[PDB]
């Protein structure tokens, strides 16, 4: 059987301060501890990538769940997905208001319809069905999110990997989206083959940045075609990465694992935050190169 | 320069009675002619794309725009997409509702917001700030569409591909729904790289089979990573639907156009209505080896 495998992201964009660096680092570490924690007591792929995102949409400093940004008519409006690599069983939803984890909903959708994506309205009657709480719109919204909101008029995609005990891969994902954005916009989160894919025969790919950018290239799918004509993961993440930003102008991150446990995170935005969980030893970091690698207690 | 094509599809389904064949075979003619009329002036693969689909909308017979087939609530949700192969640009809708050309807010999509994905409440707020008629859904229904799901209480995506004089290519798709589907399902159309992908340099395809087996296995972009490596589009076609097959149980079609201009419309379903226009011939079919091929004027 297989050693596990988790890898975690944030936002691929632009610098981070030195006071958000400690605590973006404690949130990829809480993150990526439980997905972990998930995988080494029998938990599967999907077990592990759902609990690793579960946690960032909590973590307010993260913009996926609480901590999402407002879109220009002052409301979140949240994306997320996830995939088994096994069957490719997926589940998907777009423009999801007033809930707690968009990626449990996300969830449901796979494991409970027979359908992969739902949007806005039916979403919620979903959820509203399944027994997911609402919540008042006004516990998703902290303090310094209306602030660049208005900062803006005159924070990108998390997600997770995972190759568990018993060689099964998945990725999840889950967004917020840009900020001020037009009513109802939909990026790469919740569209396979762009915010992330897994295959139980390839690999597990969860990406980050311009989500337009990443939705033109089919950004996760092609990482792994990459792969599959026998790349190494982190010439494949490069080489689709160096095809983004050369054919669209975009930028982004990926992370991914191959169904052999071999990962790599990558990235052409100014920086991504990421950690993996391997061998009972933790991976972190934020800029290129700043890696540090510690004991996993 | 190239000699042009546009090539249509309505939806890979089950068995189609003489009845139907009929009104089918002639309303893809009009789509083609359409197109290709829009070829014929030297128009742009993108406007001829939107053109073939816009008469597959309007046409009540096909699952897309008027005669969408009936959600949960006795209602009509739409879905659509388009992408130009020069630089990758596209736009899609999600869940629409009370608009007669779901592909044209697609298109202002692509051209007239910064995004590539617009859904539900957002692409209604939107079809407005662009004068977008909202126009009854009793008009989009029909006594098919209401006959059919008070009983199903107990046909298909339909698209184009285009490659112009300069050599661009492009792809439409449409589709109105599934009786008795989820509110708010959202299916393989609106999703770049399932239900279509364009880019000058392999092709373009639309897709049209079961919409989540589809996504699951991105097929439109599959079909172009094997052009990419040598195979043939015939072959192309033949292997991605295949993998469909093998892999996730789900038969479809699609139809692809190359950038050398070798076109096909294949199936692993009983039939898939299409039609196809290159150098004044018009080629068709809907069940397996039978093409019907006349000239145009
Ligand atoms: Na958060
Ligand atoms: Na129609």
């Given at each position: 059987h297989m050693n596990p495998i988790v890898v975690v992201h944030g936002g691929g964009a632009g610098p981070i301060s030195k006071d958000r660096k400690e605590r973006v680092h404690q949130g990829m570490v809480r993150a990526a501890t439980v997905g972990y924690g998930i995988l080494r007591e029998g938990g599967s792929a999907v077990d592990a990538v759902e609990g690793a995102v579960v946690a960032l949409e909590d973590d307010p400093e993260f913009n996926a769940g609480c901590?999402?940004?407002?879109?220009?008519?002052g409301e979140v409006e949240m994306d997320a997905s996830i995939m088994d690599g096994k069957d490719l069983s997926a589940?998907?939803?777009?423009?999801?208001?007033?809930?707690?984890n968009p990626i449990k909903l996300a969830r449901l959708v796979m494991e409970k319809t027979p359908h992969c994506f739902l949007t806005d309205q039916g979403a919620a009657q979903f959820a509203a069905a399944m027994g997911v709480p609402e919540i008042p719109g006004e516990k998703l919204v902290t303090e310094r999110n209306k602030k660049r909101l208005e900062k803006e008029k005159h924070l990108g995609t998390v997600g997770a990997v995972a190759l568990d005990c018993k060689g099964n891969?998945?990725?999840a994902t889950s967004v917020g989206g840009i900020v001020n954005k037009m009513v109802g916009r939909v990026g790469d989160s919740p569209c396979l083959g762009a915010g992330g894919?897994?295959?139980?025969?390839?690999?597990?790919?969860?990406?980050?940045?311009?989500?337009?950018?990443?939705?033109?290239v089919n950004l996760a799918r092609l990482t792994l075609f990459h792969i599959e004509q026998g790349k190494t993961?982190?010439?494949?993440?490069?080489?689709?990465?160096?095809?983004?930003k050369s054919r669209v102008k975009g930028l982004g991150g990926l992370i991914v694992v191959s169904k052999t446990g071999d990962w790599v995170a990558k990235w052409t935005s100014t920086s991504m935050p990421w950690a993996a969980?391997?061998?009972?030893?933790?991976?972190?970091?934020?800029?290129?190169?700043?890696?540090?690698?510690?004991?996993?207690?």
């Open positions: 901590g999402s940004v407002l879109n220009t008519n589940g998907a939803v777009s423009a999801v208001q007033c809930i707690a891969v998945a990725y894919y897994a295959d139980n025969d390839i690999g597990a790919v969860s990406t980050t940045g311009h989500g337009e950018s990443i939705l033109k993961v982190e010439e494949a993440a490069d080489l689709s990465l160096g095809y983004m969980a391997k061998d009972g030893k933790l991976h972190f970091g934020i800029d290129p190169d700043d890696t540090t690698i510690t004991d996993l207690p």
